[PDB]
Design a protein around this motif. Structure first.
Motif, short mmCIF file in Angstrom:
data_model
loop_
_atom_site.label_atom_id
_atom_site.label_comp_id
_atom_site.label_asym_id
_atom_site.label_seq_id
_atom_site.Cartn_x
_atom_site.Cartn_y
_atom_site.Cartn_z
N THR A 19 0.83 -1.22 0.00
CA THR A 19 0.00 0.00 0.00
C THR A 19 0.86 1.26 0.00
O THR A 19 0.60 2.18 -0.77
CB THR A 19 -0.95 0.03 1.19
N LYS A 22 2.26 1.59 -3.63
CA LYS A 22 1.23 1.97 -4.61
C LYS A 22 0.79 3.42 -4.49
O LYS A 22 0.53 4.05 -5.50
CB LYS A 22 0.03 1.03 -4.52
N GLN A 23 0.80 4.00 -3.29
CA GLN A 23 0.52 5.43 -3.12
C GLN A 23 1.52 6.36 -3.84
O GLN A 23 1.18 7.51 -4.06
CB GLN A 23 0.41 5.78 -1.63
N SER A 25 2.06 6.06 -7.01
CA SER A 25 1.37 6.24 -8.29
C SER A 25 0.22 7.26 -8.22
O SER A 25 -0.32 7.63 -9.26
CB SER A 25 0.82 4.91 -8.79
N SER A 26 -0.19 7.72 -7.04
CA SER A 26 -1.31 8.66 -6.89
C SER A 26 -0.91 10.08 -7.29
O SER A 26 0.21 10.51 -7.05
CB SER A 26 -1.80 8.63 -5.44
N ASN A 27 -1.84 10.82 -7.89
CA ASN A 27 -1.60 12.21 -8.31
C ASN A 27 -1.70 13.22 -7.16
O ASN A 27 -1.03 14.24 -7.21
CB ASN A 27 -2.60 12.59 -9.41
N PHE A 28 -2.58 13.02 -6.18
CA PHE A 28 -2.88 14.00 -5.13
C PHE A 28 -3.24 15.41 -5.66
O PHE A 28 -3.06 16.41 -4.97
CB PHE A 28 -1.75 14.04 -4.09
N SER A 32 1.21 15.13 -12.50
CA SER A 32 1.66 13.75 -12.68
C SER A 32 1.97 13.08 -11.34
O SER A 32 2.35 13.74 -10.38
CB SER A 32 2.89 13.71 -13.59
N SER A 33 1.87 11.76 -11.29
CA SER A 33 2.37 10.94 -10.20
C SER A 33 3.90 10.82 -10.20
O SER A 33 4.46 10.41 -9.19
CB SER A 33 1.77 9.54 -10.34
#
Lengths: 49, 50
Positions: A19, A22-23, A25-28, A32-33
């Motif tokens: 987890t 994988k975070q 890859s998040s854009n927030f 871009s990630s």
């Protein structure tokens, strides 16, 4: 299945790390990630946001 | 063209300095979105459409 206590302690630590990875890859809400996109596309004054 | 019927030009398989554009006093507006105008010389694109 009797050792489910130990195997679950391995599983919970693996799921916590997977987890956490994988975070990345998040854009927030960024463009871009991937940080090398932002730093290759924008001036520092724009990229800082 | 008239703005109801705008042209689209495919730009591809070529190299482009953009500083010859963004250094010019001609442009009464030159916004860029998702990229810096200054940074365009450091990038490649699949195609560009003008």
């Amino acid at each position: 299945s009797a050792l489910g206590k130990l195997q679950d302690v391995v599983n919970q630590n693996a799921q916590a790390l997977n987890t956490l990875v994988k975070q990345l890859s998040s854009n927030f809400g960024a463009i871009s990630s991937v940080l090398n996109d932002i730093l290759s596309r924008l001036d520092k004054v724009e990229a800082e946001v | 063209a008239s703005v109801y019927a705008w042209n689209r030009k495919r730009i591809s398989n070529c190299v482009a300095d953009y500083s010859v554009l963004y250094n010019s006093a001609s442009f009464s507006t030159f916004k860029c979105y998702g990229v810096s105008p200054t940074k365009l010389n450091d990038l490649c694109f699949t195609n560009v459409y003008a």
